[PDB]
Design a protein around this ligand. Structure first.
Ligand SMILES: CCn1cc(Cl)c2c(C(=O)C3=C(O)[C@@H]4CC[C@@H](C4)C3=O)ccnc21
Ligand SMILES: CCn1cc(Cl)c2c(C(=O)C3=C(O)[C@@H]4CC[C@@H](C4)C3=O)ccnc21
Ligand SMILES: [Co+2]
Ligand SMILES: [Co+2]
Lengths: 377, 377
């Protein structure tokens, strides 16, 4: 059931903003590791004396990397005279976030019809305000409310090129890398208590409900904005990875970003070639028994050659009533065992493809446990 | 003249330590951009609950990248029970350094005969202590004194593998990258006042003296440890780049690291191929007039084909009474216009090669000014 209860008009995920200590080095590592192009910048070279922000893109996926300059460079400014291109940015908030959490997502940004209206309706319905609506160059409106922990949900609306004040990147610095990633599929939060988190977020958005953890997924009307949230389950044999996250992150935050690929075989071939030369590492692949069991689960969807290619690349597969899901997880993106990335591709639910086609892979918890036991043999 | 006045036995540069917000992303970017192998680690996986430290190597060059974990992970520890592998590390100092300066060098480390003796003699001769000598696993001794700004000179001595507590890196994570870089040639500081800086450092080491700036170079007895120091010169037409450094760095710090290559043509070919895919950018190349003028300056040292290869790669050349110097400079390594890297290779002074052979390129200030004026034509 989908009661289509959004309290404002939501379109799609727009961008993800990482708060960094050095945006340059993180952005360059991510660009090479994920195959994303440098697309826009706002920094000293564009007149921004407050923060350095670099935008990477792959298809519709937009990753923004932001770090503060010395406050001394902008000491004479006030908010009405700021050279910051992102008006919600604050030196103290950014440094506090990074000191507390390390590298991680500060903002999950969605495009809405009217960010001013979205902000008002959200706060009227219980959202904790983080940054009020601000109109940039009479063209783009941005506002922010608290999502969980120190992560904000950022609303963006356009009257009619990322943000005013950002410059397109000189072609020579913009190498057209592309490993197949096309859009953000979902963004997952870890919280200490799932119940209150769900009630809060569903409360102010109207989003409906779509081992070691309990989870639920909030979704927009067309189920294209997908926001899973996890809480830990305590006392288990193996310690809850959600609890490990909360300890190393100093509390709630964004756990993983799932990036849809138009060709997950090519994406993973490209990413795995670069794992040891500056890119991202992947979690340990499942045993050969997992892929032998795949024939009985998805042999109608995937040929044996395609199943063999899943095995070459360490890809997991899950299936539900309506669609099939190919997925794989990176090791953590930075020093702490906190945020990681999922690469995903969905098969089915063709109407365009409906959002969440095939679910989120929860069947792979049991299929992996059983496959490792099967594999001790 | 070289009075060989070192107050203790100094061997060579040992390593450079960057203090980072996220060591993983900086280390991976540097590894790919410079062709350095991941060689050792000390982090959560090795039992270090305090800091994440990753060691990159290329030949004898050792780059260490360190970032703090949440203090909560080690809250129960005291110094006698610490799991830190680098005992001088402090969460507050590291966060304060990075907040103030951004990404940069915290420690210039030299190998000495006895780091305990070097520390005592240094402080007896005016050095400001930063971390007292500490013996690690009865095998390695480390001590630190202030060099300039928040940069420390770190003494390391070995009784008889980087540091105890570091583990060698799993071969699969250690891709054998190598673009030809072999050792640190010199490490350069920017200070507000050159005179007092020189007197202080030469005071406690016994090191002897080897537009927009004044400079002098301190050197060890065999002139293999080379420490240039710059101060700004004010009022000029173009603003002093040393002054720009001090403003954006919030004071004195390390300006550039010069990395010797055994084949600067290959190093620069390799680095330039990666500039736009996660590596390092280079400063604008000199005009064609610079390379036409090179025939008259170094035509006895470099064939026209070799001079043409310098032009392809943007390489600068300078010469003194005893040797020839090939050099090139990167753009700044991170967000702020502060630290950068020089790639260098020296021709001549064969006895092994004597240190500083060919100087440091100061002749290229005038040769570049004149070549740009020549090139307006
Ligand atoms: C193989 C072990 N494994 C590790 C992960 Cl992270 C994972 C996921 C995954 O991506 C997550 C989500 O998108 C949904 C929100 C939380 C739940 C579901 C969840 O865990 C699905 C199945 N098995 C998984
Ligand atoms: C082409 C413009 N240019 C930019 C740099 Cl950074 C540079 C250097 C260089 O590396 C530096 C040093 O190693 C020595 C210590 C300070 C002096 C000398 C100095 O500037 C030499 C010649 N020309 C240069
Ligand atoms: Co997921
Ligand atoms: Co130099």
């Amino acid at each position: 059931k989908n009661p289509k209860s959004d309290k404002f008009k939501v379109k799609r995920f727009h961008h993800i903003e990482f708060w960094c200590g050095d945006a340059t080095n993180v952005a360059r590592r991510f660009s090479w590791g994920l195959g994303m192009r440098f697309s826009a910048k706002s920094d000293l070279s564009t007149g921004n004396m407050v923060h350095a922000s670099y935008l990477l893109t792959s298809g519709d996926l937009r990753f923004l990397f932001t770090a503060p300059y010395s406050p001394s460079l902008s000491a004479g400014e006030i908010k009405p005279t700021t050279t910051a291109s992102i008006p919600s940015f604050d030196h103290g908030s950014c440094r506090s976030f990074f000191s507390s959490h390390g590298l991680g997502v500060r903002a999950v940004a969605i495009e809405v019809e009217d960010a001013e209206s979205a902000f008002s309706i959200s706060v009227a319905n219980g959202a904790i305000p983080s940054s009020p609506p601000i109109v940039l160059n009479e063209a783009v409106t941005i506002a922010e409310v608290k999502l969980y922990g120190d992560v904000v949900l950022r609303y963006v609306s356009y009257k009619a090129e990322f943000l005013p004040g950002f410059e397109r990147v000189e072609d020579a610095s913009s190498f057209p890398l592309d490993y197949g990633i096309r859009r953000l599929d979902h963004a997952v939060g870890n919280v200490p208590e799932l119940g209150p988190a769900l009630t809060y977020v569903a409360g102010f958005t109207g989003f409906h409900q779509f081992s070691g953890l309990n989870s639920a997924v909030l979704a927009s009307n067309d189920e294209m904005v997908l926001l899973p949230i996890n809480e830990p389950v305590h006392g288990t044999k193996r310690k809850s990875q959600i609890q490990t996250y909360l300890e190393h992150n100093e509390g709630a935050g964004l756990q993983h970003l799932a990036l849809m690929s138009e060709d997950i075989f090519r994406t993973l071939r490209e990413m795995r070639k670069r794992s040891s030369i500056g890119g991202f590492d992947f979690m340990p692949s499942p045993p050969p028994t997992y892929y032998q069991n795949l024939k009985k689960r998805v042999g109608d969807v995937l040929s044996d050659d395609q199943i063999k290619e899943c095995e070459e690349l360490g890809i997991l597969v899950d299936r539900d009533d309506q669609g099939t899901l190919l997925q794989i997880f990176t090791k953590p993106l930075g020093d702490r065992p906190t945020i990681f990335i999922e690469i995903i591709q969905r098969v089915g639910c063709m109407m365009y493809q409906s959002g969440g086609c095939g679910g989120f892979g929860k069947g792979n918890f049991s299929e992996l446990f059983k496959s490792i036991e099967e594999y001790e043999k």
